[PDB]
Amino acid sequence: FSRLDKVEAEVQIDRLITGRLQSLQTYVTQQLIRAAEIRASANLAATKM
Amino acid sequence: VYADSFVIRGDEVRQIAPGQTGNIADYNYKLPDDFTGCVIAWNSNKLDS
């Protein structure tokens, strides 16, 4: 904000929000893969018991 | 539609653009950040001077 004109600063700030939103998306997607793998292993311990 | 008329020096024509700062864009006439429309300027040395 203090180094760019206010007319075009809003372009750069949303150009930075995209990265911080995509980065949070890849983290969530990776967890959904791991959760299914643990779920398939928690259903095997229930049978083993 | 709105129209604003005033006479300024040649060096300060760049301050009328939104976001600029100075003795004329902060004390006499300041445009908003999300301004829609535009400005027209032309030399008037013959009459006003």
PDB file of C-alpha atoms in Angstrom:
ATOM      1  CA  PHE A   1       0.000   0.000   0.000  1.00  0.00           C
ATOM      2  CA  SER A   2       2.820   2.417   0.897  1.00  0.00           C
ATOM      3  CA  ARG A   3       4.918   1.628  -2.205  1.00  0.00           C
ATOM      4  CA  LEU A   4       2.288   1.578  -4.989  1.00  0.00           C
ATOM      5  CA  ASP A   5      -0.410   3.946  -6.189  1.00  0.00           C
ATOM      6  CA  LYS A   6      -3.891   3.265  -4.833  1.00  0.00           C
ATOM      7  CA  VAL A   7      -5.324   3.005  -8.363  1.00  0.00           C
ATOM      8  CA  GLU A   8      -3.391  -0.201  -9.112  1.00  0.00           C
ATOM      9  CA  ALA A   9      -2.443  -1.457  -5.631  1.00  0.00           C
ATOM     10  CA  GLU A  10      -5.705  -3.445  -5.458  1.00  0.00           C
ATOM     11  CA  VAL A  11      -4.534  -5.448  -8.487  1.00  0.00           C
ATOM     12  CA  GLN A  12      -1.333  -6.549  -6.749  1.00  0.00           C
ATOM     13  CA  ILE A  13      -2.946  -7.421  -3.410  1.00  0.00           C
ATOM     14  CA  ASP A  14      -5.468  -9.810  -4.988  1.00  0.00           C
ATOM     15  CA  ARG A  15      -2.571 -11.144  -7.064  1.00  0.00           C
ATOM     16  CA  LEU A  16      -1.070 -12.162  -3.697  1.00  0.00           C
ATOM     17  CA  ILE A  17      -4.315 -13.514  -2.190  1.00  0.00           C
ATOM     18  CA  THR A  18      -4.459 -16.172  -4.941  1.00  0.00           C
ATOM     19  CA  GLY A  19      -1.199 -17.735  -3.765  1.00  0.00           C
ATOM     20  CA  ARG A  20      -2.268 -17.822  -0.117  1.00  0.00           C
ATOM     21  CA  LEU A  21      -5.566 -19.411  -1.190  1.00  0.00           C
ATOM     22  CA  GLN A  22      -4.084 -22.009  -3.555  1.00  0.00           C
ATOM     23  CA  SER A  23      -1.472 -22.979  -0.937  1.00  0.00           C
ATOM     24  CA  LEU A  24      -4.226 -23.649   1.620  1.00  0.00           C
ATOM     25  CA  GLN A  25      -6.048 -25.708  -1.021  1.00  0.00           C
ATOM     26  CA  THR A  26      -3.148 -28.088  -1.695  1.00  0.00           C
ATOM     27  CA  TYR A  27      -2.797 -28.701   2.045  1.00  0.00           C
ATOM     28  CA  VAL A  28      -6.463 -29.690   2.364  1.00  0.00           C
ATOM     29  CA  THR A  29      -6.371 -31.969  -0.688  1.00  0.00           C
ATOM     30  CA  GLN A  30      -3.314 -33.800   0.656  1.00  0.00           C
ATOM     31  CA  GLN A  31      -5.084 -34.410   3.980  1.00  0.00           C
ATOM     32  CA  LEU A  32      -8.106 -35.929   2.218  1.00  0.00           C
ATOM     33  CA  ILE A  33      -5.763 -38.516   0.690  1.00  0.00           C
ATOM     34  CA  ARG A  34      -4.156 -39.333   4.046  1.00  0.00           C
ATOM     35  CA  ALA A  35      -7.491 -39.546   5.879  1.00  0.00           C
ATOM     36  CA  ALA A  36      -8.798 -42.234   3.502  1.00  0.00           C
ATOM     37  CA  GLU A  37      -5.625 -44.302   4.022  1.00  0.00           C
ATOM     38  CA  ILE A  38      -5.959 -44.134   7.820  1.00  0.00           C
ATOM     39  CA  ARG A  39      -9.674 -44.923   7.516  1.00  0.00           C
ATOM     40  CA  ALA A  40      -8.833 -48.088   5.569  1.00  0.00           C
ATOM     41  CA  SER A  41      -6.435 -49.052   8.386  1.00  0.00           C
ATOM     42  CA  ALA A  42      -8.868 -48.293  11.229  1.00  0.00           C
ATOM     43  CA  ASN A  43     -11.357 -50.636   9.525  1.00  0.00           C
ATOM     44  CA  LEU A  44      -8.723 -53.397   9.620  1.00  0.00           C
ATOM     45  CA  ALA A  45      -7.986 -53.028  13.338  1.00  0.00           C
ATOM     46  CA  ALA A  46     -11.721 -53.352  14.043  1.00  0.00           C
ATOM     47  CA  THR A  47     -11.769 -56.684  12.169  1.00  0.00           C
ATOM     48  CA  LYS A  48      -8.529 -57.858  13.802  1.00  0.00           C
ATOM     49  CA  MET A  49     -10.140 -57.311  17.205  1.00  0.00           C
TER      50      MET A  49
ATOM     51  CA  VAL B   1     -23.182  12.814 -15.262  1.00  0.00           C
ATOM     52  CA  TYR B   2     -21.218  15.457 -13.369  1.00  0.00           C
ATOM     53  CA  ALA B   3     -18.817  18.164 -14.523  1.00  0.00           C
ATOM     54  CA  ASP B   4     -16.148  19.990 -12.506  1.00  0.00           C
ATOM     55  CA  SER B   5     -14.277  23.008 -13.881  1.00  0.00           C
ATOM     56  CA  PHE B   6     -11.164  24.696 -12.496  1.00  0.00           C
ATOM     57  CA  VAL B   7      -7.892  26.206 -13.709  1.00  0.00           C
ATOM     58  CA  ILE B   8      -4.495  24.927 -12.548  1.00  0.00           C
ATOM     59  CA  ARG B   9      -0.824  25.094 -13.478  1.00  0.00           C
ATOM     60  CA  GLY B  10       0.653  22.764 -16.069  1.00  0.00           C
ATOM     61  CA  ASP B  11       2.913  20.929 -13.618  1.00  0.00           C
ATOM     62  CA  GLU B  12       0.022  19.848 -11.355  1.00  0.00           C
ATOM     63  CA  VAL B  13      -2.097  18.172 -14.056  1.00  0.00           C
ATOM     64  CA  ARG B  14      -0.666  14.792 -13.024  1.00  0.00           C
ATOM     65  CA  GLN B  15      -1.979  15.200  -9.455  1.00  0.00           C
ATOM     66  CA  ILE B  16      -5.652  15.155 -10.531  1.00  0.00           C
ATOM     67  CA  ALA B  17      -5.272  11.433 -11.220  1.00  0.00           C
ATOM     68  CA  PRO B  18      -6.587   9.328  -8.313  1.00  0.00           C
ATOM     69  CA  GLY B  19      -4.102   8.403  -5.608  1.00  0.00           C
ATOM     70  CA  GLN B  20      -1.648  11.248  -6.211  1.00  0.00           C
ATOM     71  CA  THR B  21      -0.569  13.511  -3.352  1.00  0.00           C
ATOM     72  CA  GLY B  22       0.601  17.100  -3.227  1.00  0.00           C
ATOM     73  CA  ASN B  23      -0.454  20.676  -2.540  1.00  0.00           C
ATOM     74  CA  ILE B  24      -3.367  20.451  -4.984  1.00  0.00           C
ATOM     75  CA  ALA B  25      -4.485  16.803  -4.704  1.00  0.00           C
ATOM     76  CA  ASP B  26      -4.683  16.999  -0.894  1.00  0.00           C
ATOM     77  CA  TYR B  27      -5.878  20.568  -0.206  1.00  0.00           C
ATOM     78  CA  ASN B  28      -8.197  21.664  -3.042  1.00  0.00           C
ATOM     79  CA  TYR B  29      -9.635  18.740  -5.015  1.00  0.00           C
ATOM     80  CA  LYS B  30      -9.055  15.028  -4.386  1.00  0.00           C
ATOM     81  CA  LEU B  31     -10.525  12.214  -6.524  1.00  0.00           C
ATOM     82  CA  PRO B  32     -11.821   9.025  -4.871  1.00  0.00           C
ATOM     83  CA  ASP B  33      -9.959   5.734  -5.077  1.00  0.00           C
ATOM     84  CA  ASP B  34     -12.630   3.915  -7.144  1.00  0.00           C
ATOM     85  CA  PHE B  35     -13.318   6.847  -9.474  1.00  0.00           C
ATOM     86  CA  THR B  36     -15.301   6.037 -12.620  1.00  0.00           C
ATOM     87  CA  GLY B  37     -15.190   8.551 -15.459  1.00  0.00           C
ATOM     88  CA  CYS B  38     -12.213  10.592 -16.586  1.00  0.00           C
ATOM     89  CA  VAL B  39     -10.565  13.983 -16.940  1.00  0.00           C
ATOM     90  CA  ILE B  40      -9.739  16.345 -19.804  1.00  0.00           C
ATOM     91  CA  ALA B  41      -7.011  18.997 -19.782  1.00  0.00           C
ATOM     92  CA  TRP B  42      -5.829  21.524 -22.353  1.00  0.00           C
ATOM     93  CA  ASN B  43      -3.526  24.534 -22.455  1.00  0.00           C
ATOM     94  CA  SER B  44      -5.259  27.899 -22.043  1.00  0.00           C
ATOM     95  CA  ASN B  45      -2.401  30.399 -22.261  1.00  0.00           C
ATOM     96  CA  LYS B  46      -4.227  32.716 -24.677  1.00  0.00           C
ATOM     97  CA  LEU B  47      -7.237  33.660 -22.529  1.00  0.00           C
ATOM     98  CA  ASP B  48      -6.623  33.072 -18.814  1.00  0.00           C
ATOM     99  CA  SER B  49      -3.066  34.421 -18.819  1.00  0.00           C
TER     100      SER B  49
END
